[PDB]
Design a protein around this motif. Sequence first.
Motif, short mmCIF file in Angstrom:
data_model
loop_
_atom_site.label_atom_id
_atom_site.label_comp_id
_atom_site.label_asym_id
_atom_site.label_seq_id
_atom_site.Cartn_x
_atom_site.Cartn_y
_atom_site.Cartn_z
N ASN A 40 0.83 -1.21 0.00
CA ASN A 40 0.00 0.00 0.00
C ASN A 40 0.87 1.26 0.00
O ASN A 40 0.35 2.37 0.02
CB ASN A 40 -0.91 0.01 1.24
N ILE A 41 2.19 1.08 -0.02
CA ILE A 41 3.10 2.21 -0.02
C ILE A 41 4.17 2.04 -1.09
O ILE A 41 4.78 0.97 -1.21
CB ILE A 41 3.76 2.34 1.36
N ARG A 42 4.40 3.10 -1.85
CA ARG A 42 5.41 3.08 -2.91
C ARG A 42 6.44 4.17 -2.68
O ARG A 42 6.22 5.33 -3.04
CB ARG A 42 4.74 3.28 -4.27
N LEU A 43 7.56 3.80 -2.07
CA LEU A 43 8.62 4.76 -1.80
C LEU A 43 9.58 4.85 -2.98
O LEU A 43 10.45 3.99 -3.15
CB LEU A 43 9.38 4.35 -0.53
N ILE A 44 9.41 5.88 -3.79
CA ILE A 44 10.26 6.08 -4.96
C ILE A 44 11.72 6.21 -4.54
O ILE A 44 12.02 6.77 -3.49
CB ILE A 44 9.82 7.33 -5.72
#
Length: 95
Positions: A40-44
């Motif tokens: 649920n989290i996308r840390l670029i």
Amino acid sequence: MGHHHHHHMDTIILRNIAPHTVVDSIMTALSPYASLAVNNIRLIKDKQTQQNRGFAFVQLSSAMDASQLLQILQSLHPPLKIDGKTIGVDFAKSA
């Protein structure tokens, strides 16, 4: 139980993040504030500082949970600050 027939926001985004931030920090940092999910989290990540380019996206299980974490973290007198600089919070913006 499917797709939304409308929109009401349900995701938060961090702004002005230091190049020393990682997925482990954000996890333990938001642990006592709420529960997140790897899917649920996308840390670029950046290829320059081998770390986020000063931005990170985070989604919550529900919509209210988003505002909650935003009102709960912003409810504190001292903003969010971690070794590096001051950290702010904003809602899902376009682009």
